[PDB]
Amino acid sequence: SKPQPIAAANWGSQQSLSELIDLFNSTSINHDVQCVVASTFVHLAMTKERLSHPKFVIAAQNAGNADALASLKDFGVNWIVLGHSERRAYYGETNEIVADKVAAAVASGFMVIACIGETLQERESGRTAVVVLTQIAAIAKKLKKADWAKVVIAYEPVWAIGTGKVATPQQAQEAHALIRSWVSSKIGADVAGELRILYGGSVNGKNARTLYQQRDVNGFLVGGASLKPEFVDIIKATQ
């Protein structure tokens, strides 16, 4: 069966966010699911002061240095989201760097959402499987078996990010499927079966269910629509 799903909001005005948090807080969630609200640093005091929902957690984005990591810890932040797939694509950030990162946070005890995926160009040239595998491997290279307990994987192809071009459930299932097998084989079928692999890129409340019905999809990583109330529709889709 599927491990516990995750629905992450990947973060406007304080006002607007507050109305969201109000909305969230008021929501009834009748299932085991873990909600997360990733945001820039600056919004941490607030979200943390307002978010009340038992099923929700807060997390930061892209936290690096040993120091950052310490204060987040010392601020009550326990989760992180590393948007590698985008950094790689726009700025040419290496797979080596996100790996030291995961490694480092994992060691500090954070829960880590690592974002991986391919560019339009790789997608076209049939370079997907390679690119992706290569990304997960670099990561793998720095973790001990037990470290996987704190790791979440987010399949987020550059091309579906803020485009409105959402992978089909097929494409999604396929990459999710590909990542899982690599883990299974190279790490363990235990690790694998308990791994959460989330889909990210143009997810919406209209499209979410079908993506979730897919066998290797365990939830979503939500940008845009996580700023609308429709995000709730997406939380509910995780059943």
Interhelix angle 95-108/128-140, nearest 10 degrees? 40
Catalytic residues: 84, 156
Residue 227 CA to residue 32 CA, distance in Å, equals 22
Q: Is 10 annotated as a binding residue?
A: yes
Q: Which domains does the chain have, with CATH numbers?
A: 1-239 (3.20.20.70)
Residue 62 CA to residue 106 CA, distance in Å, equals 13
Q: What secondary structure letter does DSSP report for 159?
A: G
Residue 208 CA to residue 65 CA, distance in Å, equals 35
Backbone angles phi, psi at 62, to 5 degrees: 40, 30
- The encoded tokens of residue 150 equal 């704190």
Residue 170's CB: how many other CB atoms inside 10 A?
A: 9
Question: What is the DSSP track for 15-83?
Answer: HHHHHHHHHHHT----S--EEEEEE-GGGHHHHHHH---TTEEEEEES--SHHHHHHHHTTT--EEEE-
- Count of all residues that appear for the chain in the document: 239
Following CA atoms 80, 68, 53, 12 in sequence, which dihedral angle do they give, to the nearest 10 degrees?
-90
Residue 89 CA to residue 99 CA, distance in Å, equals 16
- The encoded tokens of residue 57 equal 């957690």
Q: Do 214 and 176 meet the contact criterion of CB atoms below 8 Å apart?
A: yes
